[PDB]
Design an enzyme around this catalytic site. Structure first.
Site, PDB file in Angstrom:
ATOM      1  N   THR A   1       0.832  -1.192   0.000  1.00 33.26           N
ATOM      2  CA  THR A   1       0.000   0.000   0.000  1.00 33.26           C
ATOM      3  C   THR A   1       0.868   1.244   0.000  1.00 33.26           C
ATOM      4  O   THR A   1       1.377   1.664   1.034  1.00 33.26           O
ATOM      5  CB  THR A   1      -0.925   0.030   1.212  1.00 33.26           C
ATOM      6  OG1 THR A   1      -1.690  -1.179   1.248  1.00 33.26           O
ATOM      7  CG2 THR A   1      -1.874   1.204   1.138  1.00 33.26           C
ATOM      8  N   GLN A   2       1.046   1.824  -1.177  1.00 28.08           N
ATOM      9  CA  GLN A   2       1.793   3.062  -1.301  1.00 28.08           C
ATOM     10  C   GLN A   2       0.974   4.268  -0.878  1.00 28.08           C
ATOM     11  O   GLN A   2       1.549   5.279  -0.468  1.00 28.08           O
ATOM     12  CB  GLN A   2       2.260   3.247  -2.747  1.00 28.08           C
ATOM     13  CG  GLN A   2       3.135   2.123  -3.273  1.00 28.08           C
ATOM     14  CD  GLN A   2       4.475   2.041  -2.574  1.00 28.08           C
ATOM     15  OE1 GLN A   2       5.089   3.059  -2.260  1.00 28.08           O
ATOM     16  NE2 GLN A   2       4.937   0.823  -2.330  1.00 28.08           N
ATOM     17  N   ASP A  59      -5.868  -3.040   4.467  1.00 29.04           N
ATOM     18  CA  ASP A  59      -4.718  -3.775   4.974  1.00 29.04           C
ATOM     19  C   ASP A  59      -5.034  -4.485   6.283  1.00 29.04           C
ATOM     20  O   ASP A  59      -4.580  -5.610   6.498  1.00 29.04           O
ATOM     21  CB  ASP A  59      -3.533  -2.839   5.163  1.00 29.04           C
ATOM     22  CG  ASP A  59      -2.928  -2.386   3.876  1.00 29.04           C
ATOM     23  OD1 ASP A  59      -3.006  -3.128   2.881  1.00 29.04           O
ATOM     24  OD2 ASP A  59      -2.357  -1.287   3.862  1.00 29.04           O
ATOM     25  N   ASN A 104       6.717  -2.087   0.055  1.00 28.73           N
ATOM     26  CA  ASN A 104       5.279  -2.238  -0.141  1.00 28.73           C
ATOM     27  C   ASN A 104       4.659  -2.425   1.225  1.00 28.73           C
ATOM     28  O   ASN A 104       4.343  -3.548   1.627  1.00 28.73           O
ATOM     29  CB  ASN A 104       4.961  -3.442  -1.027  1.00 28.73           C
ATOM     30  CG  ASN A 104       3.497  -3.522  -1.412  1.00 28.73           C
ATOM     31  OD1 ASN A 104       2.709  -2.625  -1.126  1.00 28.73           O
ATOM     32  ND2 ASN A 104       3.125  -4.618  -2.049  1.00 28.73           N
TER      33      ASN A 104
END
Lengths: 216, 240
Positions: A1-2, A59, A104
């Protein structure tokens, strides 16, 4: 998750005499929009471990999926071995650091509360792998706005009862409702004791607005 | 003379419903010297008898460290026991790295059995010609596990594998009713008297041939070699 999309704000946590109590408001915001208003940011891991999370909620749903399947796959063996809260905390430290090292990250900040062998566990893990344990935890703006109240009470009185810790958690959630703009007036409080993990909620804060009339 | 159509590879079933390569690997462990394992309520002791290629050679090792809480003893092909030790040591390191806790001994033993079933079913690869005897201590107390070349694993009160280890099992089954309440020294002497009965009439347990491995509650896995088995053997009785 950028880039996190639907995030959850502060997650508290404090050890008391006989367990840990954590809380999290039930809001997932997209930017500033309070879009998802009834989502539970607290996981029950197993009988003796509970987990509340900040950051990206997709997430955290991933970590719910992976960690819950680990708990299932462990309980299928029936061999009398359970993941401790410290083991869930160490697995999760390895996971978050391993995702960090691949550039990442899982955009989360997690509070792992637990109670095994008559000893309380309270553990912080964030997206870089920085892990530690402490008598009181607070992510997000709770580290600024709730961890002062928590650590001053835990300075005066190192050993809290469950009622004192519950009132302190409610009181810090009221402060975070006043001063954090991503917080929300609806929260779950999870407790782990010898009786297991109970998730209470939705709970609200008692608002005071007497200073609104003190402007003239 | 009586040549067998079906004992060629491990992927062949006999018409009697059997796999002869697995059965023939099961007696690769009776090609190894005897080893007794036994547990109390607090400790798990592996006693093994080891042999030397000459009087100038130095007595092939049989108890091997796997972790601070798991130690095994071997009977059969010591080349396959080395593959199994490397595997088991790495699994112990992997779960002390990820979960920061020791292995359940039964999970490592399950993982060994899942490893060793694979050459019992796939072509061009033989079953592991070793049987292990696995002492461990974890949250559920001490544990004694036997793994065999048939990839079948056994949870044991006490066990003996290796050549002419029937006599130790005749000792151990007779005396297993008092293993749990032993202290450490009496549990080691039970394991030695089980090992002493896997001997011929002229042979005796000496400091050179006896190797003792103990794990316990407040004790990490330690192998007691030549000078270190003297406290354990100089309290026994003469051979009956």
């Amino acid at each position: 998750t950028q880039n996190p999309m639907v995030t959850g704000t502060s997650v508290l946590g404090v050890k008391f005499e006989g367990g840990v109590v954590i809380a999290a408001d039930m809001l997932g915001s997209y930017g500033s929009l309070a879009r998802f208003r009834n989502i539970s940011r607290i996981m029950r891991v197993n009988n003796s471990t509970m987990l509340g999370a900040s950051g990206d909620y997709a997430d955290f749903q991933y970590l719910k999926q992976v960690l819950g399947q680990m708990v299932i796959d462990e309980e299928l063996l029936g061999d009398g071995h359970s993941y401790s809260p410290r083991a869930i905390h160490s697995w999760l430290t390895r996971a978050m650091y391993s995702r960090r090292s691949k550039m990442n990250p899982l955009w989360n900040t997690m509070v792992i509360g637990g109670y095994a062998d008559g000893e309380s566990f309270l553990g912080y893990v964030d997206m870089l792998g920085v892990a530690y344990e402490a008598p009181s935890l607070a992510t997000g703006y709770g580290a600024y706005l709730a961890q002062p109240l928590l650590r001053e009470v835990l300075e005066k009185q190192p050993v809290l009862s469950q009622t004192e810790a519950r009132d302190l958690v409610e009181r810090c959630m009221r402060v975070l409702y006043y001063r954090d703009a991503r917080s929300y007036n609806r929260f779950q409080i999870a407790t782990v004791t010898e009786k297991g993990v109970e998730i209470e909620g939705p709970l609200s804060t008692e608002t005071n607005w007497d200073i609104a009339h003190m402007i003239s | 003379m009586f040549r067998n159509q079906y004992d060629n590879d491990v992927t062949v079933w006999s018409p009697q419903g059997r796999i002869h390569q697995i059965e023939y690997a099961m007696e690769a462990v009776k090609q190894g010297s005897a080893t007794v394992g036994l547990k109390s309520k607090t400790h798990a002791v592996l006693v093994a008898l080891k042999r030397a290629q000459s009087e100038l050679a130095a007595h092939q090792k049989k108890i091997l460290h796997v972790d601070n809480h798991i130690g095994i003893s071997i009977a059969g092909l010591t080349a396959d026991a080395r593959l199994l030790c490397n595997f088991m040591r790495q699994e112990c390191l992997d779960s002390r790295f990820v979960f920061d806790r020791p292995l359940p001994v039964s999970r490592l033993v399950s993982l060994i059995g899942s490893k060793t079933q694979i050459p019992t079913q796939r072509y061009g690869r033989r079953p592991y010609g070793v049987g292990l005897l696995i002492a461990g201590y974890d949250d559920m107390g001490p544990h004694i596990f036997q793994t065999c070349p048939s990839a079948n694993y056994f949870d044991c009160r006490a066990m003996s594998i290796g050549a002419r280890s029937q006599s130790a099992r005749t000792y151990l089954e007779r005396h297993m009713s008092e293993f749990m309440e032993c202290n450490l020294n009496e549990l080691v002497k039970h394991g030695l008297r089980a090992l002493r009965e896997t001997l011929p009439a002229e042979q005796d347990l000496t400091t050179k041939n006896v190797s003792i491995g103990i794990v316990g509650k407040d004790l990490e896995f330690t192998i007691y070699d030549d000078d270190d088995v003297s406290p354990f053997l100089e309290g026994l009785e003469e051979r009956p």
